[PDB]
UniProtKB/Swiss-Prot annotation, chains A, B:
Cofactor, how bound (note): Mg(2+) is required for catalysis and for stabilizing the dimer.
UniProt-listed SUPFAM superfamilies: Enolase C-terminal domain-like, Enolase N-terminal domain-like
Protein name, per record: Enolase 1
Assigned protein family: Belongs to the enolase family.
Organism classification: Eukaryota, Fungi, Dikarya, Ascomycota, Saccharomycotina
Name of the coding gene: ENO1
Amino acid sequence: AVSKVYARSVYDSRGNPTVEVELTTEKGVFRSIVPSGASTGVHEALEMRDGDKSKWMGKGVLHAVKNVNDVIAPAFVKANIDVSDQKAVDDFLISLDGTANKSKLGANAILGVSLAASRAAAAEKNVPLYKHLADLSKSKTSPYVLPVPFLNVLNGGSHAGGALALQEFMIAPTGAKTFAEALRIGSEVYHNLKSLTKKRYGASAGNVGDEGGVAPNIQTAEEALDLIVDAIKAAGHDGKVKIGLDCASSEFFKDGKYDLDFKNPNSDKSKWLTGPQLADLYHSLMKRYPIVSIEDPFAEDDWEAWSHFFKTAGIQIVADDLTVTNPKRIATAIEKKAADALLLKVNQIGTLSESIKAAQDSFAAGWGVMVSHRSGETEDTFIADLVVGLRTGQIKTGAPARSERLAKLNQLLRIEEELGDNAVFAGENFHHGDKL
Amino acid sequence: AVSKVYARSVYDSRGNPTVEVELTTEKGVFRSIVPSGASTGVHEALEMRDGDKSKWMGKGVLHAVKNVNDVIAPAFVKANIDVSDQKAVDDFLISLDGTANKSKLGANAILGVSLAASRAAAAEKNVPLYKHLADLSKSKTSPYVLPVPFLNVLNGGSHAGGALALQEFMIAPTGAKTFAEALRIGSEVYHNLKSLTKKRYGASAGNVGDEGGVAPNIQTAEEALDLIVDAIKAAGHDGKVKIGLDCASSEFFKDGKYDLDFKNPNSDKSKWLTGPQLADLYHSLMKRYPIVSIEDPFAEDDWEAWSHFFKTAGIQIVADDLTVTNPKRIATAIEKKAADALLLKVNQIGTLSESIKAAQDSFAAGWGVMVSHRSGETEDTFIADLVVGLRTGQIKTGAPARSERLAKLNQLLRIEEELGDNAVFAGENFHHGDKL
Ligand SMILES: [Mn+2]
Ligand SMILES: [Mn+2]
Ligand SMILES: [Mn+2]
Ligand SMILES: [Mn+2]
């Protein structure tokens, strides 16, 4: 029986405020901290920030904390909602807000109460959290699937200062036989990556971006993929570790063309490339490197380049800014056959039922779901139980560095050991880990 | 009644393995993750690592996890120790090890069980953790003291690539009236610091070191302190925020001289300085900047430079590598009047009673105690309850970035709000927050 929903302001991996909600019931206090940070797409639940420039640079969430305390709680206490019924909870929160992108109370005020309730529901059913989330989404639980972690090792977009235009370079130990082995293989690769990084670029290049990867002054994509294969080669794991790229292409789409060299801004124009010319640079890279996932190859509204590259891509194609975890953008994405995996960011839709709901429609269309983090994360490991309950087989939770990252890798370590014989590692079936 | 002490290997802020111990009692499972990373001094409890170069670069702690599971637990279960009696616990762990620097079972195997037991003791007494730790050390609890956080904002030692030889540049909002205000003031300063950092040095300079600060290619100390006062000036908080330096001078002591320019290594020698010449460069800096704490001004065994600078320093002088949280090095440090504050790192002595014990002898000599983090931290917030139970008034827990950092700032937010009127903020009495 919820007796108190309360909220406070706390900080995120970037020293920026975020909302922390603790919900009380006859079994204790359950908490949740809302992730934050953006690259962000236009059709997503909206986050409420103070805007006062003389306090936290205008990013406090004091308001968002007021909506929780002042609006949601007294209302939520009086409803007498069964937290076990997550839809009841979320429908209640949506009802109270009444906008389509949650701009009334704020997607941060809403999410925090929506996730705290799922923890409380599990406390109460007496099953570990990943087990409830498995109940809520109706996933096989025979056995559970531990995911391949796509680890960010190197960054290059608006996030690094050389000419490199692709944003994230990720490694995936799909070759491993257990989660624990994938994580170990993954950090030996990373650690080597840093050493080579500091010899070649200088000690300055060893510093890390927000997600834990390094951001050396690299000039070409090839130049970056080569540093990662040397890093995989030196760690002694050639053939067991794969790559994944997040090109964040919306970033360099201009005039119907893609500028592989922005950051100028003496923008050479004639080297700019059409969907199809870029489609030829990705096939190049695909043949020379062990690339198995490409996230956002084309821009958020460039549907025909998506549909035309996917007809022959033969690899996993992820949509992040093209679908903004919006079930209405997912569905077009699906009728146009524009990709085959969705990046799910629960705070992009703002509620747990709506999240679980998107993965489900992505699954029924033959798609995969890479559960993912945000730029500004917290010590909350909610997404570890979530890639385990949805049984997706793959998770992007940063590099094996900065603990807002490792707080989730560590939780997958504990779940794996906990499940004993009841867990299989996705491995190479990362794509459809749900169908295993 | 402890019924099971068990351990597993988990990862640390740096992607390097560390020991996680969970202890069971009639009230649940209590856990602790051991911090790690070094700069490290010679007379301290020793950490046990595998040494196998084909696994985690030779840094696993599989062994350390075996000593816990295989040696400590079956022994610890059979003893039937009252966890409320922390000395009984720790004396038991010391007894089982029998070396002076814990090299028998490993200071990581020992610490993790020693801290998990204090959580369990508090569960059982039914008081929040900081309240127990206050019981164990006998500190006034009328009211409690929230600490001034020394935040790392800029790094320059073996940790950055320019000529700068001092290691840590820290800001301290002592001017604030609450903890929450100090943390906010602290992140607005930091965030400005990053902006100026990226204009002046390039986007590459915005990447962060291990503790969350930035490491720009800076050349002089002055050059660095000026960037921090411009950062304090722009954030709108001149006069409320102070500085602190960690010179890690052991790093550049060579032939009885200090090389302010190592990193050469065409080491100009003649510019090298004696204790007293360096004592004159710190007084310089002290008059031009709002410096209020200097950590390790001279090297770990250079006692006469310490004693001679402290007779006229007039600011807080912290010993980290000179005392290695060793009560026997503290005491000499005290008879020689070499400093006045101790950096306490619980894993440097390896047990909670021995830690609490060192702060106590530092306190009785008129000293202050800056409770501190390690280079490789985890999502464990144990040190937040500890600066609150010892009532020291000051804590070094990294910059307001990377959540292994913010996991502890966030916990001080929650304790502060929890204590209501029962907490005062150290502010400007950070030095002797214990005597307030
Ligand atoms: Mn983001
Ligand atoms: Mn993306
Ligand atoms: Mn260290
Ligand atoms: Mn130091």
